Design a binder for this molecule. Structure first.
Ligand SMILES: Nc1nc2c(ncn2[C@@H]2O[C@@H]3COP(=O)(O)O[C@H]3[C@H]2O)c(=O)[nH]1
Ligand SMILES: Nc1nc2c(ncn2[C@@H]2O[C@@H]3COP(=O)(O)O[C@H]3[C@H]2O)c(=O)[nH]1
Ligand SMILES: [Mg+2]
Ligand SMILES: [Mg+2]
Ligand SMILES: [Zn+2]
Ligand SMILES: [Zn+2]
Lengths: 820, 807, 46, 48
C-alpha cells in the first residue's frame, strides 16, 4: 500500500510531478492573479516570496505596453525592496544641443495610485545637466549614493523646499539604451536606516533589469516613428516640387501644405524676405541729399534689410485655415514676438519652452483664437540657399501632444528647412529662363525687322503709290494684277526656263522680279489664292536675308531656284510631283542657303560656334531651315495663308526634306539608293508610263526630291565655260577666305584648297571634284530622263576645258623642275 | 504506476526534510520548489537580453525549456518577411530540443526552407494571425509534405501561434509533437500562449531595431540625394552618377549597375528610308511600354567588394556581365520591381553559375527596378546584385531602393531644364550674331566716311593712326560750316551721311580721341554702326538721336556745363546721349504694358529706356566696334556707370519724380556769390553731379521746342504724325480708344495740346537751367516764343469754333 | 547533408509556377506722391 | 488635485539666464560609319 519506495526515496517523484503538474503550476502564475507577497511586514528578506515578486514583474510583459504603468509598478515594488521611500523617474531630453532632465513620476511610495504619481508635461520640473547629483549621475553614467546630502558636493536643494521635504539621503542610478541615457531613477532617504547600504545598490541593480529593457521598447518605438515621419516629409515634398517649375512662393507653399500631417503642430507660419541686395540708382539720391533718413534697423548677417513681404500661416488646431498675408503688419500675431526678426538677424535654431516665463521675446499672453489656445512651445529656424544667406524664417508652434520640442523633434524639420533652402535652385532657374527667353524673342524681332521689305522699297517693284495713288495693302486682288504684268519680265525672252541661263548681265533687283515671275509660270499662285502682295514682300525679303559674302550670296540662291524651276518645266520632272509639291520645292530651293556665314560645317565643329552646340548634324542646313521658316511664319510676309491644314502640314514637312538634303555629307551616305530607283524606271517596258507608279508611291518622290536638291546646289559646273570659270574663281576665293580665317583664329593648317599659295593647283583639284562629287547625279538623271541631256554636255565640255589648264600647270612644273 | 490517487501526496508532503533535493533556499513544498527555479531561470534569460540584443541565442534558450513543459519533440521558429507583395516565412531556427547546442539548430541564410502564403499550416496561421491546433495532420485539408521528405521526418500533432507586433506578424513558432498524449490536452495550449508571451517581447525589440535602422538609412540616402541633385544643373549621366556614388555605404550592397535607355522617340525623315527601301530590316526586338526602343547606350557599374573600381561602359555589348542575365532588358519591357530568391537556380534569366573574377564572385540575390520620370516613361534600369549581410533582399530594402529610384526619376526636370536652357542660350547667341551682322557696317560701305582704297592702296584696317588721320582732316567738316556750336543747329538741311561726319568731328572737338588713345577706325565704324542701329520710323530715327547728341554737346561746350565734369565724364555723356533711342519701335512705354510685349516682361519699369541701354552696351562690347578698349578697368567701369545713369534717366516718368532735388540744387547755387567757387564745390561732389547730369539728360531730348519756329513747326508735325500712327495702330491691334493726342481725326486741336505740353513738361528744365546759368537763356527765350506762337494758333482755332457756334 | 538540415545550395520553396513581380506604386504620391496723380496721365506718361 | 510636484502652470527651472540657442549644422554636407573604298577622299574636300 504505502510501500511506494520509489516515491519515498528522493529525486524520483520530482520528475513525475514536473511532467504532470508543471504546466498548471506555471499557468496560474502568469495569469491575472495578484502577488502573494505580504507588504505590511517590512524586513521580509524575501525567502521564497522573492520568486513570487519576480513573476509579478514578468506578468506585465504581455503585448499591451504603455511604458508608464509597468515602470510605476516596478518602482512601487522597489520602494519596498530598497527599504526607502519617494522614488522618482527623471526623464531625459535635449533641446538646443543642451540636455535637460525632466521629472515624469514624482513622489512614488508603496501603496500609491498612479493618478497621484504621474506629472503632466504642463507642470514638470526641469533641472539642467551641469549641477546637482541628478546631473552628476547623468554625466558619470553610474550609480551613486550620497549620504547626508548637506555635506556632499554638487547638491541643489531647489525642490527640497518647494515640496517641503528633507532628503536626508540619496541613491540614484541611470538607465541607458546603448551608451545613450533615457532616464534616471532616484531614491531619497532610508525609512529605517542611517543611509543606503552597499547591498542596496546590488538589490537596485538586480531588480532594475526588468525596468531597464521596458523603457527601451518605448524609446525605440518613438525613435522609429520619428524616423518614419522624417522619411515621409522628404518624399512627399519631392513630388510637389518636381510636378512643375514655379516661383519660390508657390513652390514653398505647395511643399509646406502637402506635408502638414507629418508635422504634428498646432500652427506654423513661414515669412519670406525681400531678396534685393542693392537699391536702384534713383532710389539712393534722396538719402544722400538729406531727404528720407537712412535705415538704422536690424539687418541680416550678409547685410540686407529684414523686410517680411509675405507671411504664410497654416492653422490646424481648430478648423483648417491656410491664408496668405502679403505685406503683413509688424504687429502680426506671428510677428508680435521678436523671434522671427531675431532669427533673421542671427540665424540660429531658436527653441523656446515657455511663453509665460519668456523675458527676452515677450510672447503673447492671451488666447489668440476664440477657443482657448495660448502659445506655449515655439521652434523657429532660418532657411539658407546654399550660401549662408537667409531666404526666410519658419516658426512651428505648439505640438499636438503637449511636450516641448526635443532633439529628435528638432532634427525633423531641421532637415526640412534644409530641403527648402536647397530647393531654391528651381525658383532661381524659373526667373532666368523667362528673362533669357524674353531676350531671345527681342533679338529675334530685331533680326526679323532687319530682314524685311518695308513700305519704302516695296514700291520699287510693286508701285501702286503713283499709278494708282494708294498703298498696296488696300488694292483689290484683281486690281493688283495689272501693275505686275507691265513690270515682270517675260519668261520666254529672258531665258529663265532653260538650262543655259546666266544672271551676270541682270541687275541685283532683276533676280527678285525673275523669282516673282517664276511662280506665275507654274500656274500655282492663282489656284492656291496666295496674296500677290505677300508673295512680292517675301521674294524681296529673301534677297535681304542672304549675306553679302563672296559666293553664297543671294545670286547663288536664285541660281539654284532657277535650276529647280528649269528641271520642273523643261525637264518634264513635273509629272511625278504634285502642284503643291512644286510650290514647296521652288520656295525651298530659293532659301536653301539663307543667312550663310561663309564657313562650312567643319569650321562650326572646330570653333565651337553656337550653331554647332545646338544642331547635332548638318549644322548649316538645319540653321538655314529654321531661319527660312521664321520669315514665312508671320503675317504680311507668308505665302501659305490660304492653305488648309493638311496641305499646310504637307508643304512644311517637305521643306525639311529638301533643305536638309542639300548637305554633301548626307548626299554621299545615301547616294546609291537613287540608282536602284533609276534602274526600276527602265524596267517598265512597252510604255513611257513609269510615271503613274511614281505618283502614288511617294517615297520614291521624296528620294528624287532629295536627289534634285543635290543636282541644283552644285549646278555651277553645268553652266557654259564663260560663267563656270568666274564661278570657280569666286568659290576658290571664298575657300581661301575661310582658310585665312581658320589659320589665325584656331592656329591650324587648312586643307590644300583653302591655302592661298595653292592657287595654281585649282584646275587639278577642280577636275577631281567634278569627277568625284559631280558626274554621278548628272549622269544618273541623264540616263533616267532624256529631256535633261544638255547638262551632261556642259559637264563634259567644262571638264575637257579644265584639263587644258590642269595640264598647262603640269608642263610648267615639269619644265621648272627640269631647270633644276 | 498510479493513475489519479496520488494527488494529496506530492504537495501536502511539503518535503519533510528541509534539505531535500540537495539544497533548498526556503521552499515549502513541490509547488514552491518549481516556482523558485522557474523564476531564477527566467530572470537569467531576462538578464541575457538586457543589452546587445541577441535574438537567436536567447530565443533558442526560451524554446529549449518550453518544449519540455509541453512534452513536444521539437520546437522551431519561422521568421516572416515580405517580397514583391507576397509574404514568405523563412526557416531561422529549426528542430530545437532540450539536448542541443545553438549551432545544431540554427539555419544559415543559404539553407532556408521558405513557404508561401497558403501552402501548409505555417502559412494558414500567417494568413489567419491566430492559433491552430491539429489533433491529426492527415485530416486538415491544407497541409504540406515538402518539409517531410527532405527531413525524413513524420509529424502527427502540431501546435502553432504567430508572433504579432500590433497587426504585423513577426514570426510563427510551432511545436510538432505531443509524445505522452494524443491531442495536445488544452491545459498545454494556455501555458504555450502565456509562457511564449514574454518571449514575444524580444522578437518585437529586434524587429523594431531593424525597422529603425532601415528607416534611418532611407532618410540619410534621401537627404544626400536631395543635397547633390540641387548642386547644379547637369546632364542626366553626371547627375545620376553623382547621386548614386555619393550614397554607397548605406545601400549595404556589393555590386549594382545603372543602365540608361536611349530616348529617341520618333526617327528622323532620312533615318527610315532604307527600312522600306528593300534593305535594313526593321527592328524586331522588345520595346518599352510607352512605345520606344530598348537600347542601353551607357551603363555605369559600381563594385563595393574588395575595391571600388568604379568604371563606365560607353557602349555595353550584349555579353556584358550585367545585361547578359536578361533581367535589365525585362524591366524595360514592363515596369516591375523584380526580386529573385536564388539566382543560380532560375530558368527565366540566365545567371552565370560560375564565378566572374579571380575573387570568386557569384551572384545570389538580384533586385532591379526602373527609373520613371513622372511621365510614366522608363528612363533607366538600376540593378543591385547582393547584400553585405548575406541575407536575401527583404521588403525594407525594397522600399528603400524604390524610394531612392523614385526620387531620382522625379529628378529629371533638372536635366530637362538644363537642356532647354542650353538650347535657348544658343538661340539667343545666334540671334545676337544676326543682329550684329545686320547692324555693323561692312568694309565696302565704310569707304564713304574715310576713303582709303582711293587715297591709299591699303585696307582701312591695315593703316597707322598718323596716316589714318590725314584722310579725316580733309573729309571731316569744320566747326563753322555746320555750326554744331549753336543752340539753333538745323538738322533737315544735312543728309543722314553728313550727320555721322558731324558726330565724328564733335568727338574730335572734345579732345578725347587723342587723350585716351582710342583708334580712329573703331570710332568711325562705331558711329556708322550706331547710325545704322536706329529704325526708319517717322520721328525717333538717327536724325533725332544725333540732334539730342548735338544739343547736349552744345550745352557742354557753349553752355559752360563742361566745367563741373572732367574730360572722361564728358566722353561718357556725348556717347550716351548719341545712343539713347537706338532701337525704338515707335510705340511708347505705356504701349508695351497694354500689348504684352516681351519688353514689358523683361524690364519692370522704364520698359523702353532701360532696353536701349542693353543694346547700346552690346554694340560697344565686341572689339572693332568698342571705343572703350584702351580705358583701364576703373575708367571703363566709371564710363559704364555714367552711361547706365544717363540712358535710363531720359525717361519722363523719372523726370517728374526727381525734379525737386534739381530745384533745390539750383537754389543752393545762389548762396555762393563767387560762381568761380561753386565750380570747385560741385566738381568734387558725386551725387550732385549725377543729379545734374540726369537732369541735362532729359533737358536735351525734350529739345526741338527751343528751336526757331520754322524748324519747330515741322518737328511738331513729325511728332504728331508718329503719335497718330501709334493711335491708328492702337484701335485695331488693341481695339481701344486712343487718348486725344493719338486720334488722327483730332489733328485740328494740335496747337492747344502743344501749349499744354509746353507749360507742364517743359518750361521747368528750361527755366531752372536758365536760372542756374545765364549762358543758356536763348533756349528758354525761343521756347517762350514758340509757346506764344502755338497759343496764337490755338486762339485762332478757338475763334474758328466760336464762329461755328455763333456764325 | 549533416551540416545543415538536409538543405544546401540556396533556399528551397514548395512552389512551382510563374514568378509574380511587384506592380510598382503609382498612387501614393500625386503710387508716387501727387496732388492729383492723373493730371499728367492725359499725356504719354502713365 | 494633488499635482504630485505641487507646482502648476508651466515647467519650472532652478537657474535663470539669457536664452542660449543652437547653431546651424553644416559640418557634414557643405564641406566645400561610312561605307567606303577609302575615307580620305572626302577629307580632301569640305566633306567630313
Ligand atoms: N519630493 C521628492 N523630491 C525628490 C524625489 N526624488 C528626488 N527629489 C528631489 O529632487 C532633487 C534632485 O537632486 P537634488 O540635490 O539632488 O535633491 C533631489 C530632491 O530634492 C522624490 O521622490 N520626491
Ligand atoms: N519543429 C519542427 N517542425 C517541423 C519539422 N518538420 C516539419 N515541421 C513543420 O511542420 C509543418 C507541417 O506542415 P507545414 O506547413 O506544412 O510545414 C511544416 C513545418 O513547419 C521538424 O523536424 N521540426
Ligand atoms: Mg549649302
Ligand atoms: Mg526715349
Ligand atoms: Zn547652296
Ligand atoms: Zn530720344
Amino acid at each position: 500500500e504505502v510501500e511506494k519506495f520509489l516515491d519515498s526515496n528522493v529525486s524520483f517523484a520530482k520528475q513525475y510531478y514536473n511532467l504532470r503538474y508543471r504546466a498548471k503550476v506555471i499557468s496560474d502564475l502568469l495569469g491575472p492573479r495578484e502577488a502573494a507577497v505580504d507588504f505590511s511586514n517590512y524586513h521580509a528578506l524575501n525567502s521564497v516570496e522573492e520568486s513570487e515578486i519576480i513573476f509579478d514583474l514578468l506578468r506585465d510583459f504581455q503585448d499591451n505596453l504603455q511604458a508608464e504603468k509597468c515602470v510605476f509598478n516596478v518602482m512601487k515594488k522597489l520602494c519596498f525592496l530598497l527599504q526607502a521611500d519617494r522614488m522618482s523617474l527623471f526623464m531625459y531630453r535635449a533641446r538646443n544641443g543642451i540636455a535637460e532632465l525632466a521629472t515624469r513620476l514624482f513622489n512614488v511610495h508603496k501603496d500609491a495610485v498612479l493618478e497621484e504619481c504621474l506629472v503632466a508635461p504642463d507642470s514638470e520640473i526641469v533641472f539642467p545637466l551641469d549641477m546637482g547629483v541628478v546631473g552628476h549621475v547623468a554625466l558619470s553614467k553610474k550609480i551613486v549614493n550620497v549620504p547626508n546630502t548637506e555635506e556632499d558636493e554638487h547638491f541643489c536643494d531647489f525642490v527640497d523646499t518647494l515640496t517641503e521635504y528633507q532628503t536626508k539621503n540619496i541613491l540614484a542610478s541611470p538607465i541607458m539604451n546603448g551608451k545613450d541615457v533615457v532616464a534616471i531613477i532616484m531614491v531619497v532617504n532610508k525609512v529605517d536606516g542611517p543611509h543606503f547600504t552597499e547591498n542596496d545598490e546590488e538589490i537596485l541593480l538586480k531588480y532594475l533589469n526588468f525596468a531597464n529593457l521596458i523603457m527601451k521598447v518605448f524609446h525605440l518605438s518613438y525613435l522609429h516613428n520619428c524616423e518614419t515621419r522624417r522619411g515621409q516629409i522628404l518624399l512627399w515634398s519631392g513630388s510637389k516640387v518636381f510636378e512643375e517649375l514655379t516661383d519660390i512662393e508657390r513652390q514653398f507653399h505647395k511643399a509646406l501644405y502637402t506635408v502638414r500631417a507629418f508635422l504634428n503642430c498646432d500652427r506654423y507660419s513661414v515669412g519670406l524676405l525681400d531678396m534685393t541686395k542693392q537699391k536702384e540708382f534713383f532710389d539712393v539720391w534722396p538719402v544722400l541729399m538729406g531727404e528720407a533718413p537712412p535705415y538704422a534697423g536690424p539687418r541680416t548677417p550678409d547685410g540686407r534689410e529684414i523686410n517680411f513681404y509675405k507671411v504664410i500661416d497654416y492653422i490646424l488646431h481648430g478648423k483648417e485655415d491656410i491664408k496668405v498675408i502679403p505685406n503683413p503688419p509688424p504687429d502680426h500675431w506671428a510677428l508680435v514676438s521678436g523671434l522671427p526678426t531675431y532669427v533673421a538677424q542671427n540665424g540660429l535654431i531658436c527653441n523656446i519652452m515657455n511663453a509665460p516665463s519668456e523675458d527676452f521675446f515677450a510672447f503673447q499672453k492671451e488666447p489668440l483664437d476664440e477657443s482657448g489656445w495660448m502659445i506655449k512651445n515655439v521652434l523657429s529656424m532660418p532657411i539658407v540657399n546654399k550660401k549662408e544667406e537667409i531666404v526666410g524664417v519658419a516658426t512651428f508652434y505648439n505640438r499636438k501632444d503637449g511636450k516641448p520640442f526635443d532633439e529628435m523633434d528638432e532634427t525633423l524639420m531641421e532637415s526640412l528647412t534644409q530641403f527648402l533652402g536647397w530647393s531654391v535652385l528651381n525658383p532661381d532657374t524659373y526667373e532666368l529662363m523667362n528673362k533669357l527667353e524674353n531676350r531671345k524673342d527681342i533679338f529675334q524681332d530685331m533680326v526679323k525687322y532687319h530682314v524685311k521689305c518695308d513700305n519704302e522699297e516695296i514700291q520699287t517693284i510693286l508701285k501702286t503709290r503713283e499709278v494708282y495713288g494708294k498703298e498696296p495693302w488696300e488694292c483689290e486682288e484683281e486690281e493688283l494684277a495689272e501693275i505686275l504684268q507691265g513690270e515682270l519680265p517675260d519668261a520666254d525672252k529672258y531665258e529663265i526656263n532653260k538650262f543655259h541661263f546666266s544672271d551676270l548681265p541682270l541687275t541685283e533687283l532683276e533676280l527678285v522680279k525673275c523669282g516673282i515671275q517664276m511662280y506665275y509660270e507654274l500656274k500655282v499662285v492663282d489656284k492656291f489664292h496666295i496674296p500677290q502682295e505677300a508673295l512680292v514682300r517675301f521674294m524681296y525679303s529673301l534677297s535681304k536675308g542672304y549675306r553679302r559674302i563672296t559666293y553664297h550670296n543671294w545670286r547663288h540662291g536664285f541660281n539654284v531656284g532657277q535650276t529647280m524651276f528649269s528641271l520642273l518645266v523643261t525637264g518634264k520632272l513635273k509629272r511625278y510631283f504634285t502642284d503643291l509639291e512644286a510650290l514647296a520645292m521652288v520656295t525651298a530651293a530659293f532659301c536653301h542657303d539663307i543667312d550663310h556665314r561663309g564657313t562650312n560645317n567643319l569650321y562650326q565643329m572646330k570653333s565651337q560656334n553656337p550653331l554647332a552646340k545646338l544642331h547635332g548634324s548638318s549644322i548649316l542646313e538645319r540653321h538655314h531651315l529654321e531661319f527660312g521658316k521664321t520669315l514665312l511664319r508671320d503675317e504680311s510676309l507668308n505665302i501659305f495663308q490660304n492653305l488648309n491644314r493638311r496641305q499646310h502640314e504637307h508643304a512644311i514637312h517637305m521643306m525639311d526634306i529638301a533643305i536638309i538634303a542639300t548637305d554633301l555629307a548626307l548626299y554621299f551616305k545615301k547616294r546609291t539608293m537613287f540608282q536602284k530607283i533609276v534602274d526600276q524606271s527602265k524596267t517598265y517596258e512597252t510604255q513611257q508610263e513609269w510615271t503613274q507608279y511614281m505618283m502614288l508611291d511617294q517615297t520614291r518622290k521624296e528620294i528624287v526630291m532629295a536627289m534634285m536638291m543635290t543636282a541644283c546646289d552644285l549646278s555651277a559646273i553645268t553652266k557654259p565655260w564663260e560663267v563656270q570659270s568666274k564661278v570657280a574663281l569666286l568659290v576658290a576665293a571664298e575657300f581661301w577666305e575661310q582658310g585665312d580665317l581658320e589659320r589665325t583664329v584656331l592656329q591650324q593648317n587648312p586643307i590644300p584648297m583653302m591655302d592661298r599659295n595653292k592657287a595654281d593647283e585649282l584646275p587639278k583639284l577642280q577636275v577631281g571634284f567634278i569627277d568625284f562629287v559631280c558626274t554621278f547625279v548628272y549622269k544618273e538623271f541623264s540616263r533616267f530622263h532624256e529631256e535633261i541631256t544638255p547638262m551632261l554636255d556642259g559637264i563634259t565640255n567644262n571638264r575637257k576645258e579644265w584639263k587644258a589648264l590642269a595640264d598647262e600647270y603640269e608642263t610648267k612644273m615639269k619644265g621648272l623642275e627640269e631647270e633644276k | 504506476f498510479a493513475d489519479q490517487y496520488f494527488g494529496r501526496k506530492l504537495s501536502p508532503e511539503d518535503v519533510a526534510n528541509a534539505c531535500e533535493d540537495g539544497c533548498p533556499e526556503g521552499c515549502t513544498s513541490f509547488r514552491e520548489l518549481c516556482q523558485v527555479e522557474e523564476s531564477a531561470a527566467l530572470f537569467e534569460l531576462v538578464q541575457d537580453m538586457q543589452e546587445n540584443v541577441n535574438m537567436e541565442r536567447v530565443v533558442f534558450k526560451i524554446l529549449r525549456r518550453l518544449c519540455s513543459i509541453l512534452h513536444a519533440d521539437r520546437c522551431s521558429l519561422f521568421m516572416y518577411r515580405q517580397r514583391n507583395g507576397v509574404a514568405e516565412l523563412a526557416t531561422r531556427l529549426f528542430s530545437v530540443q532540450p539536448d542541443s547546442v545553438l549551432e545544431d539548430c540554427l539555419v544559415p541564410p543559404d539553407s532556408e526552407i521558405v513557404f508561401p502564403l497558403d501552402i501548409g499550416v505555417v502559412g494558414h496561421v500567417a494568413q489567419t494571425k491566430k492559433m491552430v491546433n491539429v489533433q491529426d495532420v492527415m485530416e486538415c485539408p491544407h497541409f504540406s509534405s515538402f518539409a517531410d521528405e527532405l527531413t525524413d521526418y513524420v509529424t502527427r500533432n502540431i501546435l502553432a501561434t504567430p508572433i504579432m507586433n500590433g497587426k504585423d506578424v513577426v514570426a510563427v513558432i510551432m511545436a510538432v509533437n505531443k509524445l505522452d498524449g494524443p491531442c495536445f490536452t488544452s491545459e498545454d495550449e494556455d501555458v504555450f500562449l502565456k509562457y511564449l508571451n514574454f518571449g514575444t517581447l524580444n522578437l518585437k525589440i529586434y524587429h523594431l531595431s531593424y525597422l529603425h535602422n532601415c528607416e534611418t538609412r532611407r532618410g540619410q540616402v534621401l537627404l544626400w540625394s536631395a543635397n547633390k541633385v540641387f548642386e547644379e544643373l547637369t546632364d542626366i549621366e553626371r547627375q545620376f552618377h553623382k547621386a548614386f556614388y555619393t550614397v554607397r555605404a548605406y545601400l549595404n550592397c556589393d555590386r549594382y549597375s545603372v543602365g540608361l535607355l536611349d530616348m529617341t522617340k520618333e526617327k528622323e525623315f532620312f533615318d527610315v528610308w532604307p527600312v522600306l527601301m528593300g534593305e535594313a530590316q526593321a527592328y524586331s526586338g522588345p520595346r518599352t511600354p510607352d512605345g520606344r526602343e530598348i537600347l542601353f547606350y551607357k551603363v555605369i557599374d559600381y563594385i563595393l567588394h574588395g575595391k571600388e573600381d568604379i568604371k563606365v561602359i560607353p557602349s555595353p555589348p550584349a555579353d556584358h556581365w550585367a545585361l547578359a542575365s536578361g533581367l535589365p532588358t525585362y524591366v524595360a519591357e514592363s515596369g516591375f520591381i523584380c526580386n529573385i530568391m536564388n539566382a543560380p537556380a532560375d530558368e527565366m534569366f540566365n545567371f552565370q553559375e560560375g564565378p566572374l573574377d579571380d575573387s570568386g564572385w557569384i551572384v545570389k540575390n538580384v533586385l532591379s527596378m526602373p527609373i520613371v520620370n513622372k511621365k510614366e516613361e522608363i528612363v533607366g534600369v538600376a540593378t543591385f546584385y547582393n547584400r553585405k549581410d548575406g541575407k536575401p533582399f527583404d521588403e525594407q530594402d525594397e522600399v528603400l531602393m524604390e524610394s531612392l529610384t523614385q526620387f531620382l526619376g522625379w529628378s529629371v526636370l533638372n536635366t530637362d531644364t538644363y537642356d532647354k536652357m542650353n538650347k535657348l542660350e544658343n538661340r539667343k547667341d545666334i540671334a545676337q550674331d544676326m543682329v550684329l551682322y545686320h547692324v555693323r557696317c561692312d568694309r565696302e560701305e565704310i569707304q564713304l566716311i574715310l576713303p582709303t582704297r582711293e587715297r591709299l592702296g591699303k585696307e582701312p584696317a591695315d593703316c597707322e593712326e598718323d596716316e589714318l588721320g590725314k584722310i579725316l582732316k580733309e573729309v571731316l567738316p569744320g566747326p563753322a560750316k555746320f555750326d554744331i556750336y549753336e543752340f539753333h543747329f538745323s538738322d533737315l538741311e544735312c543728309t543722314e551721311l553728313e550727320l555721322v561726319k558731324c558726330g565724328i568731328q564733335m568727338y574730335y572737338e572734345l579732345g578725347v580721341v587723342r587723350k585716351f588713345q582710342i583708334p580712329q577706325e573703331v570710332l568711325v565704324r562705331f558711329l556708322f554702326s550706331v547710325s545704322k542701329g536706329y529704325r526708319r520710323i517717322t520721328y525717333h530715327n538717327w536724325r533725332h538721336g544725333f540732334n539730342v547728341a548735338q544739343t547736349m554737346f552744345t550745352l557742354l561746350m557753349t553752355g559752360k556745363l563742361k566745367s563741373y565734369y572732367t574730360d572722361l565724364e564728358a566722353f561718357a555723356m556725348v556717347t550716351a546721349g548719341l545712343c539713347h533711342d537706338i532701337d525704338h519701335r515707335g510705340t511708347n512705354n505705356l504701349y508695351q504694358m497694354k500689348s504684352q510685349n516681351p519688353l514689358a516682361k523683361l524690364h519692370g519699369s522704364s520698359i523702353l529706356e532701360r532696353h536701349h541701354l542693353e543694346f547700346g552696351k552690346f554694340l560697344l562690347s565686341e572689339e572693332t566696334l568698342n571705343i572703350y578698349q584702351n580705358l583701364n578697368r576703373r575708367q571703363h567701369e566709371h564710363v559704364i556707370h555714367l552711361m547706365d545713369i544717363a540712358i535710363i534717366a531720359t525717361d519722363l516718368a523719372l523726370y517728374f519724380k526727381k525734379r525737386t532735388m534739381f530745384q533745390k540744387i539750383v537754389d543752393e547755387s545762389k548762396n555762393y556769390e563767387d560762381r568761380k567757387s561753386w565750380v570747385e564745390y560741385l566738381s568734387l561732389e558725386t551725387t550732385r553731379k549725377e543729379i545734374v547730369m540726369a537732369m541735362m539728360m532729359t533737358a536735351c531730348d525734350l529739345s526741338a521746342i527751343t528751336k526757331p519756329w520754322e524748324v519747330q513747326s515741322k518737328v511738331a508735325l513729325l511728332v504728331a504724325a508718329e503719335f497718330w500712327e501709334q493711335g491708328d495702330l492702337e484701335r485695331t491691334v488693341l481695339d481701344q480708344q486712343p487718348i486725344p493726342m493719338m486720334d488722327r481725326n483730332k489733328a485740328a486741336e494740335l496747337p492747344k495740346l502743344q501749349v499744354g505740353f509746353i507749360d507742364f513738361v517743359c518750361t521747368f528744365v528750361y527755366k531752372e537751367f536758365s536760372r542756374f546759368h545765364e549762358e543758356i537763356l536763348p533756349m528758354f527765350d525761343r521756347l517762350q516764343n514758340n509757346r506764344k506762337e502755338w497759343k496764337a494758333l490755338a486762339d485762332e482755332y478757338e475763334a474758328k469754333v466760336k464762329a461755328l457756334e455763333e456764325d | 547533408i549533416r551540416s545543415a538540415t538536409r538543405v544546401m545550395g540556396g533556399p528551397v520553396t514548395p512552389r512551382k509556377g510563374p514568378p509574380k513581380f511587384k506592380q510598382r506604386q503609382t498612387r501614393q504620391f500625386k503710387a508716387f506722391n501727387h496732388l492729383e496723380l492723373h493730371e499728367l496721365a492725359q499725356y504719354g506718361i502713365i
